[PDB]
Amino acid sequence: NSNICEVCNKWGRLFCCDTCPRSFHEHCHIPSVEANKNPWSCIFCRIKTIQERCPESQSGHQESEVLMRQMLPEEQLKCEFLLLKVYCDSKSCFFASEPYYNREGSQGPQKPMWLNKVKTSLNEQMYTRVEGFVQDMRLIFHNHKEFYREDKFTRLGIQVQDIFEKNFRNIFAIQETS
Numbered sequence: 001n002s003n004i005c006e007v008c009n010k011w012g013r014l015f016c017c018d019t020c021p022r023s024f025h026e027h028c029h030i031p032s033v034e035a036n037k038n039p040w041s042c043i044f045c046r047i048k049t050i051q052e053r054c055p056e057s058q059s060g061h062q063e064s065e066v067l068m069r070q071m072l073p074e075e076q077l078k079c080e081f082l083l084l085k086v087y088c089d090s091k092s093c094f095f096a097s098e099p100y101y102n103r104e105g106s107q108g109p110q111k112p113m114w115l116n117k118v119k120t121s122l123n124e125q126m127y128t129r130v131e132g133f134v135q136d137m138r139l140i141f142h143n144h145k146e147f148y149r150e151d152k153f154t155r156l157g158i159q160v161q162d163i164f165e166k167n168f169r170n171i172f173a174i175q176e177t178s
């Protein structure tokens with residue numbers, strides 16, 4: 001197994017996947033690494049199994065159809081994995097914890113949102129459709145763009161949104177377009 005966490009790239013108290021060489025901090029994995037379970041398979045491995053069981057699941061889909069899907073166990077898992085792929089980028093730090101807004105010439109968003117809030121919402125099964133999770137994720141970056149205006153810091157929102165959107169298209173097998 002790797003000697004650094006797959007998500008934050010640090011050493012520490014690491015749990016090792018039994019079916020792949022990745023390792024995780026307990027609360028870096030999503031869901032948090034399960035108490036017992038021998039063997040244990042990481043989210044990467046669990047997603048790869050879904051694909052392998054249903055190869056046709058990789059054919060292209062329309063985003064509108066994916067969004068309306070109910071959050072059954074496979075869709076729950078896919079959203080957890082997509083959230084984890086965002087935390088994998090170091091720039092996610094800016095969006096992880098609860099923000100506050102006090103900048104001359106700007107007003108804070110009406111509905112603040114942040115990664116750890118989405119993480120709790122998934123854990124608590126608060127989303128009934130994929131659409132709920134995707135709307136909160138996109139809200140994080142939209143709030144950031146609106147608040148930071150012409151400050152160059154706006155670009156951090158564009159960057160992490162791009163990581164979200166690429167991973168969304170991969171994980172949910174969105175039909176490729178020009």
Ligand SMILES: [Zn+2]
Binds near residue numbers: 005007024
């Ligand atoms: Zn970690």
Ligand SMILES: [Zn+2]
Binds near residue numbers: 018041044
């Ligand atoms: Zn694994």
Ligand SMILES: [Zn+2]
Binds near residue numbers: 057
């Ligand atoms: Zn199948």
